Coordinates of N, CA, C and O and ligand atoms in Angstrom, one line a residue:
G1 N -9.6 14.3 5.2 CA -8.2 14.3 5.9 C -8.5 13.7 4.7 O -7.7 13.9 3.6
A2 N -7.1 12.5 5.0 CA -6.3 12.3 4.3 C -6.5 11.6 2.4 O -5.3 11.8 2.3
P3 N -7.3 10.5 3.3 CA -8.0 10.0 1.9 C -8.7 11.1 0.7 O -8.1 10.6 -0.2
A4 N -9.2 12.0 1.3 CA -9.9 12.9 0.3 C -8.1 13.8 -0.1 O -9.0 14.0 -1.6
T5 N -7.3 14.0 0.3 CA -6.3 14.5 0.2 C -6.1 13.8 -1.3 O -5.2 14.4 -2.0
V6 N -6.0 12.2 -1.2 CA -5.1 11.8 -2.7 C -6.2 11.4 -3.3 O -5.6 12.0 -4.3
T7 N -7.6 11.7 -3.1 CA -8.4 11.9 -4.2 C -7.9 13.3 -4.9 O -7.8 13.1 -6.0
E8 N -7.9 14.0 -4.2 CA -8.0 15.8 -5.1 C -6.6 16.2 -5.8 O -5.9 16.5 -6.7
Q9 N -5.3 15.4 -4.9 CA -4.4 15.6 -5.0 C -2.8 14.7 -5.7 O -1.6 14.7 -6.2
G10 N -3.6 13.4 -5.5 CA -2.6 12.1 -6.1 C -2.4 11.8 -7.6 O -3.3 12.1 -8.5
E11 N -1.2 11.0 -7.5 CA 0.0 10.8 -8.6 C -1.2 9.4 -9.3 O -1.2 8.7 -8.2
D12 N -1.8 9.3 -10.2 CA -2.6 8.2 -11.1 C -1.1 7.2 -11.5 O -0.4 7.9 -11.9
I13 N -0.4 6.5 -11.0 CA 0.3 5.4 -10.6 C 0.3 4.1 -11.9 O 0.9 3.3 -11.9
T14 N -1.0 3.9 -12.1 CA -1.4 2.8 -12.6 C -0.9 2.5 -14.1 O -0.9 3.8 -14.6
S15 N -0.5 1.3 -14.8 CA -0.3 1.7 -16.2 C -1.5 2.0 -16.9 O -1.0 2.9 -17.8
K16 N -2.9 1.7 -16.4 CA -3.8 2.2 -17.4 C -4.3 3.2 -17.4 O -5.1 3.8 -18.4
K17 N -4.0 4.1 -16.6 CA -4.6 5.7 -15.7 C -6.1 5.7 -16.1 O -6.1 6.7 -16.2
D18 N -6.6 4.2 -14.5 CA -7.6 4.2 -14.4 C -7.9 4.6 -13.0 O -9.0 4.4 -12.4
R19 N -6.9 5.6 -12.9 CA -7.2 6.1 -11.4 C -7.4 4.9 -9.6 O -7.8 5.2 -9.1
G20 N -7.1 4.0 -10.3 CA -6.9 2.6 -9.0 C -5.8 2.7 -8.4 O -6.7 2.1 -7.4
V21 N -5.0 3.3 -8.7 CA -4.0 3.3 -7.3 C -3.7 5.0 -7.4 O -2.9 5.3 -8.8
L22 N -3.5 5.5 -6.4 CA -3.7 7.1 -5.7 C -2.0 7.1 -5.4 O -2.5 6.6 -4.2
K23 N -1.8 8.1 -5.4 CA -0.7 8.3 -4.4 C 0.2 9.5 -4.0 O 0.3 10.3 -5.3
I24 N 0.4 10.2 -3.2 CA 1.2 11.0 -2.5 C 2.5 10.8 -1.6 O 2.4 10.0 -0.7
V25 N 3.4 11.5 -1.9 CA 4.8 11.3 -1.2 C 4.9 11.6 0.0 O 4.2 13.6 -0.3
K26 N 4.7 11.6 1.2 CA 4.4 12.1 1.9 C 6.1 13.3 2.6 O 6.2 13.8 4.2
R27 N 6.3 11.7 3.1 CA 8.6 12.0 3.5 C 8.8 11.6 2.4 O 9.3 10.5 1.7
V28 N 10.4 12.5 1.4 CA 11.3 11.7 0.7 C 11.7 10.8 1.3 O 13.0 10.6 2.4
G29 N 12.0 9.7 0.7 CA 13.7 8.8 1.0 C 14.7 9.0 0.2 O 15.2 9.7 -0.2
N30 N 15.5 7.6 0.7 CA 17.3 8.1 0.1 C 17.3 7.0 -1.4 O 16.9 5.8 -1.3
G31 N 18.4 7.4 -2.1 CA 18.6 6.8 -3.2 C 18.1 6.4 -4.1 O 16.9 7.0 -4.2
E32 N 18.8 5.9 -5.3 CA 18.3 5.6 -6.5 C 17.3 4.7 -7.1 O 16.5 4.5 -7.7
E33 N 17.4 3.4 -5.8 CA 16.9 1.7 -6.4 C 15.7 2.0 -5.9 O 15.2 2.3 -4.7
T34 N 15.1 1.3 -6.4 CA 13.3 0.9 -6.0 C 12.8 -0.4 -6.0 O 14.0 -0.8 -6.7
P35 N 12.4 -0.9 -5.3 CA 12.3 -2.8 -5.5 C 11.5 -2.9 -6.7 O 10.6 -2.5 -7.1
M36 N 12.3 -4.4 -6.9 CA 11.4 -5.2 -8.0 C 11.1 -6.2 -7.7 O 11.3 -6.9 -6.3
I37 N 10.3 -7.1 -9.1 CA 9.3 -7.8 -8.6 C 11.0 -9.4 -7.8 O 11.8 -9.0 -8.3
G38 N 10.3 -9.8 -6.8 CA 11.1 -10.8 -6.5 C 11.5 -10.5 -5.3 O 12.4 -10.7 -4.5
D39 N 12.1 -8.6 -5.1 CA 12.5 -8.5 -3.9 C 12.1 -9.2 -2.5 O 10.9 -8.5 -2.6
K40 N 12.5 -9.2 -1.3 CA 12.4 -8.5 -0.2 C 11.8 -7.6 -0.1 O 12.8 -7.0 0.3
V41 N 10.5 -7.1 0.6 CA 10.6 -5.7 1.6 C 9.9 -5.4 2.7 O 9.3 -6.4 3.1
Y42 N 10.3 -5.2 3.8 CA 10.3 -4.6 4.7 C 9.5 -2.9 5.3 O 10.1 -2.4 4.5
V43 N 7.9 -3.4 5.3 CA 7.8 -1.9 5.8 C 6.8 -1.9 7.1 O 6.9 -3.3 8.0
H44 N 6.9 -0.3 7.2 CA 5.2 -0.1 8.3 C 4.7 0.1 7.8 O 4.5 0.7 6.6
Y45 N 3.6 -0.3 8.0 CA 1.7 0.6 7.3 C 0.9 0.3 8.6 O 0.8 0.3 9.2
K46 N 0.0 1.7 8.4 CA -1.2 2.1 8.5 C -2.2 2.0 7.5 O -2.5 2.7 6.3
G47 N -3.0 1.1 7.6 CA -4.1 1.1 6.5 C -5.3 1.2 7.4 O -6.0 0.6 8.2
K48 N -7.0 1.4 6.3 CA -7.8 1.6 6.2 C -8.7 1.5 5.1 O -9.0 1.6 4.4
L49 N -9.9 0.9 5.7 CA -10.6 1.4 4.7 C -11.3 2.9 5.0 O -11.3 3.2 5.4
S50 N -11.3 3.0 3.2 CA -11.8 4.8 3.3 C -12.7 5.2 4.0 O -12.8 6.3 4.4
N51 N -14.3 4.6 4.2 CA -15.2 4.5 5.3 C -14.5 4.5 6.3 O -15.1 4.7 7.7
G52 N -13.1 4.5 6.9 CA -13.2 4.9 8.2 C -13.0 4.1 9.5 O -12.6 3.7 10.1
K53 N -13.7 3.0 8.9 CA -13.9 2.0 9.7 C -12.9 0.1 9.2 O -12.7 0.2 8.0
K54 N -12.0 -0.4 10.8 CA -10.7 -1.1 10.1 C -10.1 -0.1 10.0 O -9.9 0.0 8.7
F55 N -8.8 -0.3 11.2 CA -7.8 0.5 11.3 C -6.8 -0.9 11.4 O -7.1 -1.1 12.2
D56 N -5.7 -1.1 10.8 CA -5.4 -2.1 10.6 C -3.3 -1.4 10.2 O -3.4 -0.9 9.7
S57 N -3.1 -2.6 11.7 CA -1.6 -1.5 11.2 C -0.4 -2.7 12.2 O -0.8 -3.6 12.6
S58 N 1.0 -2.5 11.0 CA 1.9 -3.2 11.6 C 2.1 -3.3 12.7 O 2.6 -4.3 13.6
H59 N 2.2 -2.1 13.7 CA 2.9 -1.7 15.1 C 2.1 -2.1 15.7 O 2.7 -3.3 17.1
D60 N 0.4 -2.5 15.6 CA -0.2 -3.7 16.5 C 0.4 -4.5 16.6 O 0.5 -5.5 17.5
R61 N 1.0 -5.6 15.8 CA 1.6 -6.7 15.7 C 3.4 -6.2 16.4 O 4.3 -7.0 16.4
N62 N 3.8 -5.6 16.6 CA 5.6 -5.1 17.0 C 5.9 -4.9 16.5 O 7.5 -5.6 16.7
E63 N 6.0 -5.9 14.7 CA 7.3 -6.1 14.1 C 6.8 -5.5 12.5 O 5.6 -5.4 12.6
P64 N 7.9 -5.3 11.9 CA 7.6 -4.9 10.1 C 6.9 -6.2 9.8 O 6.7 -7.0 10.0
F65 N 6.4 -5.5 8.7 CA 4.8 -6.7 8.0 C 6.6 -6.7 6.4 O 7.4 -5.1 6.4
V66 N 6.6 -7.8 6.4 CA 7.6 -8.4 5.3 C 6.9 -8.9 4.0 O 6.5 -10.3 4.7
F67 N 7.4 -9.0 3.2 CA 6.4 -9.5 1.2 C 7.6 -9.5 0.8 O 8.6 -8.6 0.6
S68 N 7.4 -10.0 0.0 CA 8.3 -10.5 -2.0 C 7.7 -9.7 -2.2 O 6.3 -10.2 -2.4
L69 N 8.2 -8.7 -3.1 CA 7.5 -8.1 -4.1 C 7.1 -8.7 -6.1 O 8.0 -9.8 -5.9
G70 N 5.6 -8.8 -5.9 CA 4.9 -9.6 -7.0 C 4.7 -10.8 -6.8 O 4.6 -11.7 -7.9
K71 N 5.3 -11.4 -5.8 CA 5.3 -12.6 -5.3 C 3.4 -13.0 -5.2 O 3.1 -14.5 -4.9
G72 N 2.3 -12.5 -5.1 CA 0.9 -12.4 -5.3 C 0.7 -12.9 -3.9 O -0.1 -13.4 -2.9
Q73 N 1.6 -11.7 -2.4 CA 0.9 -12.5 -1.2 C 0.9 -11.0 -0.8 O -0.1 -10.9 0.4
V74 N 0.6 -10.0 -1.4 CA -0.1 -8.9 -1.1 C -1.5 -8.3 -2.4 O -0.7 -8.7 -3.3
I75 N -1.8 -7.0 -1.9 CA -2.2 -6.9 -3.0 C -2.0 -6.0 -4.4 O -1.0 -5.8 -4.4
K76 N -2.5 -6.4 -5.8 CA -1.8 -5.8 -6.5 C -1.7 -4.2 -6.4 O -0.6 -3.9 -7.0
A77 N -2.1 -3.2 -5.9 CA -2.1 -2.0 -5.5 C -0.9 -1.7 -5.0 O -0.3 -1.3 -5.0
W78 N -0.3 -3.0 -4.0 CA 1.0 -3.0 -3.0 C 2.4 -2.9 -3.8 O 3.0 -2.0 -4.0
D79 N 2.1 -4.0 -4.5 CA 2.8 -4.5 -6.0 C 3.7 -3.2 -6.9 O 4.8 -2.9 -7.3
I80 N 2.3 -2.6 -6.7 CA 2.4 -1.8 -8.2 C 3.0 0.0 -7.1 O 4.3 0.8 -7.7
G81 N 2.2 -0.4 -5.8 CA 2.9 1.5 -5.2 C 3.9 1.1 -4.1 O 5.0 2.0 -4.6
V82 N 4.5 0.0 -3.9 CA 6.0 0.0 -3.4 C 6.6 -0.2 -3.8 O 7.9 0.2 -4.2
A83 N 6.8 -0.9 -5.6 CA 7.8 -0.9 -6.3 C 8.1 0.8 -7.2 O 9.3 1.1 -7.6
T84 N 7.3 1.8 -6.7 CA 7.4 2.7 -7.3 C 7.8 4.0 -5.6 O 8.6 5.2 -5.9
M85 N 8.2 3.4 -5.0 CA 9.2 4.1 -3.2 C 10.7 3.3 -3.4 O 10.4 2.9 -3.7
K86 N 10.6 4.8 -2.4 CA 12.6 4.7 -2.0 C 12.3 4.2 -0.8 O 11.7 4.5 0.2
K87 N 13.7 3.6 -0.2 CA 14.3 3.2 1.1 C 14.1 4.5 1.7 O 14.2 5.9 1.8
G88 N 13.1 4.1 3.4 CA 12.7 5.5 4.1 C 11.7 7.0 3.8 O 11.1 7.3 4.3
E89 N 11.0 6.6 2.8 CA 10.2 6.9 2.3 C 8.5 6.6 2.6 O 8.6 5.3 3.3
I90 N 7.6 7.5 2.8 CA 6.6 7.2 3.2 C 5.4 7.8 2.3 O 6.1 9.1 2.3
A91 N 4.2 7.0 2.2 CA 3.9 7.7 0.6 C 2.1 6.6 1.4 O 2.2 6.3 2.4
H92 N 1.2 7.9 0.6 CA 0.1 7.6 1.6 C -0.8 7.1 -0.2 O -0.3 7.2 -1.2
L93 N -1.6 5.9 -0.4 CA -2.4 5.3 -1.7 C -3.5 5.0 -0.9 O -4.0 5.0 -0.2
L94 N -4.1 5.8 -1.7 CA -5.7 5.4 -2.1 C -6.3 4.0 -3.3 O -5.6 4.8 -4.4
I95 N -6.6 3.4 -3.0 CA -6.9 2.1 -3.4 C -8.4 1.7 -4.1 O -9.1 1.5 -2.9
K96 N -9.0 1.8 -6.0 CA -10.3 1.0 -6.1 C -10.2 -0.5 -6.1 O -8.9 -1.2 -5.7
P97 N -11.4 -0.8 -5.5 CA -10.9 -2.3 -5.2 C -10.5 -2.9 -6.9 O -10.4 -4.2 -5.9
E98 N -10.4 -2.7 -7.9 CA -9.8 -2.9 -9.1 C -9.2 -3.8 -8.7 O -8.3 -4.6 -9.0
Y99 N -7.8 -2.6 -7.3 CA -6.8 -3.4 -7.2 C -6.0 -3.8 -5.7 O -5.6 -3.7 -5.8
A100 N -7.3 -3.9 -5.3 CA -7.7 -4.8 -4.3 C -8.4 -6.0 -3.8 O -7.6 -7.3 -4.7
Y101 N -9.1 -5.9 -3.1 CA -9.9 -7.3 -3.0 C -11.8 -7.4 -4.1 O -12.4 -8.1 -3.7
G102 N -12.0 -6.6 -4.7 CA -12.3 -6.6 -5.6 C -14.3 -6.4 -5.2 O -14.4 -6.3 -4.6
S103 N -14.8 -7.6 -6.5 CA -16.6 -7.4 -6.2 C -16.5 -8.6 -5.5 O -17.5 -8.5 -4.4
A104 N -16.2 -9.1 -5.2 CA -15.9 -10.4 -4.0 C -15.8 -10.1 -2.5 O -16.1 -10.1 -1.8
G105 N -15.1 -9.3 -2.3 CA -14.2 -9.1 -1.4 C -13.6 -9.5 -0.5 O -12.8 -10.6 -1.1
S106 N -13.1 -9.6 1.4 CA -12.4 -10.5 1.5 C -13.2 -10.2 3.0 O -12.3 -10.2 4.2
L107 N -14.0 -10.7 3.2 CA -15.1 -10.8 4.5 C -13.9 -11.2 5.6 O -13.9 -12.9 5.7
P108 N -14.4 -11.8 7.0 CA -15.3 -10.4 7.2 C -14.5 -8.9 7.2 O -14.7 -7.9 7.7
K109 N -13.1 -9.2 7.1 CA -12.5 -7.8 7.5 C -13.0 -6.9 5.8 O -13.2 -5.4 6.3
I110 N -12.5 -7.2 4.6 CA -12.8 -5.9 3.7 C -14.5 -7.1 3.0 O -14.7 -7.9 2.7
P111 N -15.3 -6.2 2.7 CA -16.5 -6.0 2.1 C -16.4 -5.9 0.8 O -15.2 -5.0 0.5
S112 N -17.5 -6.1 -0.3 CA -17.5 -6.4 -1.9 C -17.2 -4.9 -2.2 O -17.5 -3.4 -1.5
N113 N -16.1 -4.7 -2.9 CA -16.6 -3.1 -3.8 C -15.1 -2.1 -3.5 O -16.3 -1.1 -2.7
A114 N -14.4 -2.3 -2.1 CA -14.3 -1.8 -0.9 C -13.0 -0.6 -1.6 O -12.1 -1.6 -2.2
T115 N -12.8 0.7 -1.4 CA -11.6 1.7 -1.6 C -10.6 1.6 0.0 O -11.5 1.5 1.0
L116 N -9.8 1.0 0.2 CA -8.6 1.4 0.7 C -7.6 2.5 0.5 O -7.0 3.2 -0.4
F117 N -7.1 2.8 2.3 CA -6.0 3.9 1.8 C -5.1 3.0 3.4 O -5.5 2.5 4.4
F118 N -4.0 3.5 2.7 CA -2.7 2.9 3.3 C -2.0 4.2 3.2 O -1.6 4.9 2.8
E119 N -1.2 4.1 4.5 CA 0.3 4.7 4.8 C 1.8 3.8 4.9 O 1.3 3.0 6.0
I120 N 2.3 3.9 4.0 CA 3.5 2.9 4.2 C 4.9 3.9 4.2 O 4.8 4.9 3.3
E121 N 5.6 3.3 5.4 CA 6.8 3.4 4.6 C 8.2 2.1 4.4 O 7.8 1.4 5.0
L122 N 8.2 2.7 3.6 CA 9.7 1.4 3.2 C 10.1 1.7 4.1 O 11.5 2.6 4.0
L123 N 11.0 0.4 4.9 CA 12.0 0.3 5.5 C 13.1 -0.2 5.5 O 14.3 0.6 5.2
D124 N 13.0 -1.2 4.1 CA 14.2 -1.4 3.7 C 13.9 -2.7 2.3 O 12.4 -3.2 2.4
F125 N 14.2 -3.6 1.0 CA 14.3 -4.3 0.8 C 15.5 -5.1 0.3 O 16.5 -4.2 0.2
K126 N 15.7 -6.4 -0.4 CA 16.4 -7.0 -0.3 C 16.0 -7.8 -1.7 O 15.1 -8.1 -1.4
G127 N 17.8 -8.1 -2.4 CA 17.3 -8.9 -3.5 C 17.6 -10.4 -3.3 O 17.6 -11.1 -2.2
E128 N 16.3 -11.4 -4.0 CA 15.9 -12.2 -3.7 C 17.6 -13.4 -3.8 O 18.4 -12.6 -4.8
Ligands
LIG1 C1 -7.7 -9.1 4.0 O1 -7.3 -10.0 4.6 C2 -6.7 -9.1 5.8 C3 -6.0 -7.9 5.1 C4 -5.8 -6.8 5.7 C5 -5.0 -7.3 7.4 C6 -4.7 -9.0 7.7 C7 -5.7 -9.8 6.5 O2 -6.1 -11.1 7.3 C8 -4.8 -11.8 6.6 O3 -4.0 -9.1 8.5 C9 -3.7 -8.4 9.2 C10 -2.3 -9.3 10.3 C11 -1.2 -9.2 9.4 C12 0.2 -9.7 10.3 N1 -1.2 -9.4 7.6 C13 -1.3 -8.9 7.0 C14 -1.3 -10.0 5.8 N2 -2.0 -11.2 6.5 N3 -1.8 -11.1 7.9 C15 -2.0 -9.8 4.4 C16 -3.4 -10.0 3.8 C17 -2.8 -9.3 2.4 O4 -2.7 -7.6 2.8 C18 -2.8 -7.0 1.6 O5 -3.0 -7.7 0.9 C19 -3.2 -5.3 2.7 C20 -1.4 -5.0 2.2 C21 -0.2 -5.3 3.0 C22 -0.9 -5.6 4.3 C23 -2.4 -5.6 4.9 N4 -3.1 -4.9 3.9 C24 -4.7 -5.5 4.1 O6 -5.5 -5.3 2.9 C25 -5.0 -5.0 5.4 C26 -6.9 -4.4 5.6 C27 -6.0 -3.3 5.4 C28 -7.9 -2.4 5.2 C29 -8.0 -2.5 6.3 C30 -7.9 -3.6 6.6 C31 -7.3 -4.6 7.1

């Protein structure tokens, strides 16, 4: 399903073109602006290890997930991927460990060398 679809069909949005972050737009957003470093960004997300174990979602907290883009508050892949999204867009990202939690991982939630999958909906973003 979704992770394999991104493997097969996703755009490589990395500067190095190492397939570290692959993206499919699932629902098109509105407007010309995309988030820039420093912006406060508001999202809903569903995430999981690509091996389907551990499913984490903002809905569990009954509240949007808010972060500042580029401020080291989220994994590199989010900084890269959310900067490509329009307001209202829903996208799927598939992420190699070098753009997430690497060889160390982040136990107990994230093992070493983990590939991650997210669905992200961009709700809003505001300038610092
Ligand atoms: C490695 O630790 C975790 C990883 C992830 C979630 C974690 C977490 O423990 C802190 O808590 C979820 C609760 C929520 C309100 N929240 C989100 C963050 N901190 N608290 C942000 C923490 C860092 O997360 C990220 O950079 C990414 C993108 C933003 C959304 C959360 N992310 C995760 O890596 C998830 C992880 C997704 C894959 C399945 C397991 C959880």
